[PDB]
Amino acid sequence: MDEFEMIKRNTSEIISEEELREVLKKDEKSALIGFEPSGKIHLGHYLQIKKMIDLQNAGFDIIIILADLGAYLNQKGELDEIRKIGDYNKKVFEAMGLKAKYVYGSEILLDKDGTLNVYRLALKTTLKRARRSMELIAREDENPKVAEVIYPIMQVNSIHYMGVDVAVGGMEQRKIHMLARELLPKKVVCIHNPVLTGLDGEGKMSSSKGNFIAVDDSPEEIRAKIKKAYCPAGVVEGNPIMEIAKYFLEYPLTIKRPEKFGGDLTVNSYEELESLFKNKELHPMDLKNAVAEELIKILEPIRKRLAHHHHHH
């Protein structure tokens, strides 16, 4: 594959592909993604960091925004707690093999103006668009706060401030990104990753108990959580185990069994795996066992790299 294909692989949309091809011609180019700091870093994060690595392998300079003010505004807690988690997240992303520059969103909105541009954008942004852009983002609040409509403006400002060619995020960020293309003098190319279903099969992967696989989870925790995941036979849509096979696994993939069941199974592509599962010729428990074992191998260097630091040895 060429650079465009490597970047596009496993994305949900690129706005626009034509604009991306032009960016790829530049000698210098940069991309950002922002994260609200999270106590657990899970496959949802990993999916997107993998995409940032694709960009880095295509010669992009990578900027990671640790969105401490964003998280603060979105009711994640006190700023100092949030920043401590942010620093931990940086270590995890480093342990994933990412080469990037890391900045706190508060650095922007406080130390430059910069701060002033937030006010300028607020003049241009309707309350309606701001609130609508937060639908898939904002924490639940019966009495929605001013904080909610400041959040998207801040994200648009960070994009402008960092002067990047590309902004990356999950599909939930798309409306904020559409605002960014309307509000800033230069239109940023937007790359959106799919939303990873949680292990429970109920909405996105999040840090709720048993609902995520964290990159530093122990092998026994990975087996246990995969074993109890939502995964109905023949069902590919909304199936978090099939999603994991699609987004993280390498092929050919060998699936141990049985052989009253079709015997050992060597699957050459995800598309083949999908066909097998869809036609009910591969049972959930066999899929789960393989996915768990491969995921343990995939995440092992990350876990070890973290522990290797989490001493000084």
Ligand X SMILES: N[C@@H](Cc1cc(Cl)c(O)c(Cl)c1)C(=O)O
The site for ligand X (CB under 6 A) is made up of 34-36, 65, 67, 70, 105, 137, 151, 154-155, 158, 173
CB closer to ligand X out of 171 and 249: 171
| Residue 215 near residue 46, CB atoms below 8 Å | yes
Shortest Å distance, C-beta 258 to ligand X: 43
Measured in degrees and rounded to the nearest 5, phi and psi for residue 117 equal: -65, -25
Shortest Å distance, C-beta 89 to ligand X: 11
CB closer to ligand X out of 6 and 79: 79
Shortest Å distance, C-beta 12 to ligand X: 15
> What is the three-state SS of 168-199?
EEEHHHHHHHHHHHHHCCCCCEEEEECCCECC
Alpha-carbon separation of residue 214 from 31, 72, 135, 226 (angstroms): 25, 23, 26, 12
Shortest Å distance, C-beta 24 to ligand X: 23
Q: Show Cβ contacts of residue 121 under 8 Å, excluding neighbours closer than 6 positions.
A: 153, 156, 157, 183
The residue of the chain with the least Cβ separation from ligand X equals: 34
CB closer to ligand X out of 69 and 273: 69
Q: Peptide bond before 194: cis, by omega within 30 degrees of 0?
A: no
CB closer to ligand X out of 70 and 284: 70
* Residues composing the chain: 313
CB closer to ligand X out of 206 and 275: 206
* 161, amino acid identity: Y
Shortest Å distance, C-beta 256 to ligand X: 38
